[PDB]
Amino acid sequence: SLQDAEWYWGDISREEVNEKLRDTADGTFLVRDASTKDYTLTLRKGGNNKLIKIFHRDGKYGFSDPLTFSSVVELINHYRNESLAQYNDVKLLYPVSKYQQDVKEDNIEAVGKKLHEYNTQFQEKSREYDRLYEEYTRTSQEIQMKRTAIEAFNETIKIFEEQCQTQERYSKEYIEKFKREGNEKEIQRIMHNYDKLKSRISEIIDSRRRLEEDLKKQAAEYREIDKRMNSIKPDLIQLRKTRDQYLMWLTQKGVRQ
Amino acid sequence: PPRPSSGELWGIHLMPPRILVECLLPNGMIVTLECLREATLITIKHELFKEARKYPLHQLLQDESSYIFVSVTQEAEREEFFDETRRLCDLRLFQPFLKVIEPVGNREEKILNREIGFAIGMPVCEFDMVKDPEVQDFRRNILNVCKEAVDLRDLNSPHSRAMYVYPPNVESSPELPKHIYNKLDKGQIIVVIWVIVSPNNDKQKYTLKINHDCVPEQVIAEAIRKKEQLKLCVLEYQGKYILKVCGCDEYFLEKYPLSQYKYIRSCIMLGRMPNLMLMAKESLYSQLPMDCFTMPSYSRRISTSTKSLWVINSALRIKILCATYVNVNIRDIDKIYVRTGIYHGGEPLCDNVNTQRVPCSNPRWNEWLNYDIYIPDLPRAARLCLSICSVKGRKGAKEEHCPLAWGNINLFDYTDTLVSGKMALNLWPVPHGLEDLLNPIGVTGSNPNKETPCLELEFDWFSSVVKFPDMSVIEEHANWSVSRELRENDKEQLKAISTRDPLSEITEQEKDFLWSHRHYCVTIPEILPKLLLSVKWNSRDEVAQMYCLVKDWPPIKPEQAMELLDCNYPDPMVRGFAVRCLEKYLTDDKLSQYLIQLVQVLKYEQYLDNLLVRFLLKKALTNQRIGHFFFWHLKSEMHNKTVSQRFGLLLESYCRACGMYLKHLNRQVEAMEKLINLTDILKQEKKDETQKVQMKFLVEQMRRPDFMDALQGFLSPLNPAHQLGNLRLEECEIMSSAKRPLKLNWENPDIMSELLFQNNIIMFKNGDDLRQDMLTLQIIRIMENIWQNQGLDLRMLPYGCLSIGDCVGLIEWVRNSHTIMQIQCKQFNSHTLHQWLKDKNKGEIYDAAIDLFTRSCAGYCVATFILGIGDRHNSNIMVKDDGQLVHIDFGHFLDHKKKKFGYKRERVPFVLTQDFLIVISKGAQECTKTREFERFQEMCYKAYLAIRQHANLFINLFSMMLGSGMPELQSFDDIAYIRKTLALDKTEQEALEYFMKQMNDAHHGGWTT
């Protein structure tokens, strides 16, 4: 009684079978029409999707010669209760029902109207996520720039502070040489240049302090954008999945070929 | 690290005319000096030491000549400025200061390192600081490649040197295609040899009529013969001259049939006159400086029980300790968990194992995860792919799982050592578009950004250093395993498997069949990709037997072998065999052709030191046409922290051994930084400004002596053979369209530029991702090249396009081209296009235009439909004065419209309108009924089956690009589009019926069988 088989899905694509078996338990399966025009069973084992052909000759079916079974149904039903270990090592335990795939609106007008609402909601949430992604990318890049600029400041501060250490080494024995020679105006000159240097270092220290404070603020903004995106991402996938479903139930209900 | 912005200072794009610079003298004093922004460092040092006398302790200062400057660059580097002829505006200073220092250390090495660091865009000194042994060993061990390359390059004195700089631009086969050969008037070419006679530099033409397969020396011989005992003179004087293409730096130095050269081959095909230039070897060979490789600092220094994997009687287990944090809205999620998986390429080796769910606020698991894999059965390329997923189960029984951060780890390291003990992994942001809970295609290794979620892990200890067994031990075990009837039909089924496209379904029955016949398979060597997928990689018995078979496997075609280098084939023996096929059979034409993909597959490589990186590097240093694009492809991706360390270390070794080309590259790099800076100003501080003022700022800044010195007299990054002479400022433009790209016109400075082109026009785009456009024009070249060899003159014009950084690149401006929209103006007819073409090509050459238009139409009609190029319109399609049709802007491909609108349809992006049909039908009233259109339909039906016959290649080219970051190309399912348009699961007759139906449904009938 095939075509009225929860696990039989017809002209379903390999990529569609993949979506339906993604992260499923060993034993999960579905049957479909081969990628030619002939049946292929897809099964989950060891995190992989194994394709098994359903061979046909003289009205008989099976995976290999001899073809023992009368129909595609009898074939599945044997392997639903007995392991594949003989042929080979798991039973066909979890069917992927086409009926369980809910989405219950009766008529074309009702479907069409609902799809229009979903498609609208989908483009709305899409544009929202795309603008969030742009905010996320920009922020992350500016954070990168600030962290490089802070490194550059740290080095500048290191060079400038080494400058003080140098003036401190040289000046000591010259201030002593000028104190003896009573050259108070020259001592004033050495000191004025030293003040000038410490005033510059003081400004460079504040330029970094301000940027480190911008960095703390931008890092927190990033964390928020990340939280806001990790929230939009799963809802958008489902909203897209529903839209694709209402589009499929419309293509099917209407005239085909 | 890399430079944040391309400005003259931090947060300043251009310096004001005069700028105050803080100078830190060696006596400890500080001097505020007013500097001209374009003032060189030698001038600044002269003004400073004069001014230094007016400050205390001036007596402690030595001579101006005993010092040099040091400052903090935008890369946060303390850079010593040895080149005192550099301008202040070109120093890339963080802040305006200079420190006066007496120069110490190795001067030669410091200068080279600065030059390498400038090309890379990252200071070399950052690599020396990297603690990781793999990094340091890679920098050490890669130098034999560099040493061998420079040895081969100077082995043949001036000839081998010239062969590196100007390699032959030849095709892969001398065999002239039947359709091309028929253009030769009695199997022989007419060439025009030009010569600059030494007294007055007067050009002189000598028109020959020689055989197409005549070696360049024979072409020279006939030139001397043109001017019976003359043989002595020609035999002695035919080795003292070389041939060059008129207008560019393309040289005929190797003994290839003249017809095998691409310029000659294009000339035969296009019914154009080949114009060559005769010059002596002496005038070229002298201009060639001898390249010198020097063993770096890091090489001249050291820099500082065993069990088998197989003698371990336990199953693999990994412990997840804790995570530092995750970024989740506590209200919107329930729990968090670490999903893990053991993978061999993109396929799990066992079922994926999750940890228990814990609150987001408490990411502590301290749980051993158990895997269904016996440790001896672990393959060499086995990886742990993990991620931290969130989980919410509010709406129904429907649990919503979302990946937060991911990371991949190599179970064995570069030394074949299995990983043991604790490990801290900094995780990566989940890529845009990826929905899977795991990212197995993603890079291996910790995230360099330590301000990200960090995961602690514990790997088991077995009381010793566990090593993967030796190849002798594996060869042994295979002979144990093998020790534990053809049929004409079975040989037919096998043959059929090998011919299938790389993405087709392999049933478990076909897998068992292929493995059972593994020894017969050596007769059909092309079957190896499908057989390798029939292997059970989680069984050491099958892996061992496969290793033996691949060791003595016959070599396969390079295009078939490139498949074994994608994300699906991680085994070192597989990729080893794959690299040997490229080594022996891949031409320099094909390597240059598939370089994009070859650079890309370097990301899938588990380790930095591998045979592919060695092959590619060897070739990049052996050929500088290869080395120019190898350098740019790697450089364009240095902003991507997922590959920056790998590509950085690769660029270092390359720049360390490429010789003089580094100087030319550095010129291209400094030209590009200026354009990036100029376009950054217009996009920011001048966005909400008038196009008239924008141009006034543009022309003023482009007149600056510092800008002109850098933006004139350098090689084109689109084609190194093309010299970019003096900028023709009057012909430069900011394009009106929103995005506002730069149209730049340079003068070709070639002596005989008039015979090629006198102007080189390049568009500088800053804001859009050019990689998709780059890949499309590449595939289009590869499509046309197949058509020509199969006898089809569907002549498309794929112009040059290069990505030079993150959303920044160059595009060749196609000369004499106009958009349909432009033609339809200067109240419009369906004949406007046909009229324009009838008026731009009068009388005699009217048909030569209509032929060019129809042929290029069919090319584009098939190319666009196969690839699924973004919607075509009057602004995207352009026609040259020739009749040559050209498509612009290929930003989208495959089904880019699948997520936005759920509609499953292979679209016809290029629907030939009435306007277009009229042109083919030469102005007829019933266009579909014509004989002109019949020849068009035929062209398309041929073009399509040609490509469908070569599907395997295109599918591999795309598959090799999965890890690149291209939105439309993120999974093998994205590549399934090409399998639908080429209708691969159908017969060639069915596929062609499908094409015809697609063509009819879009054109509303007319496409007759």
Ligand SMILES: C[C@@H]1Cn2ncc(-c3ccc(S(=O)(=O)N(C)C)cc3)c2CN1c1ccnc2[nH]ccc12
């Ligand atoms: C630089 C490339 C190639 N190319 N070569 C010539 C032209 C061209 C542009 C405008 C006109 S016109 O409007 O009739 N005019 C004469 C008034 C005629 C020709 C172009 C355009 N083009 C692009 C521009 C933007 N985004 C791109 N993405 C990929 C290619 C590309």
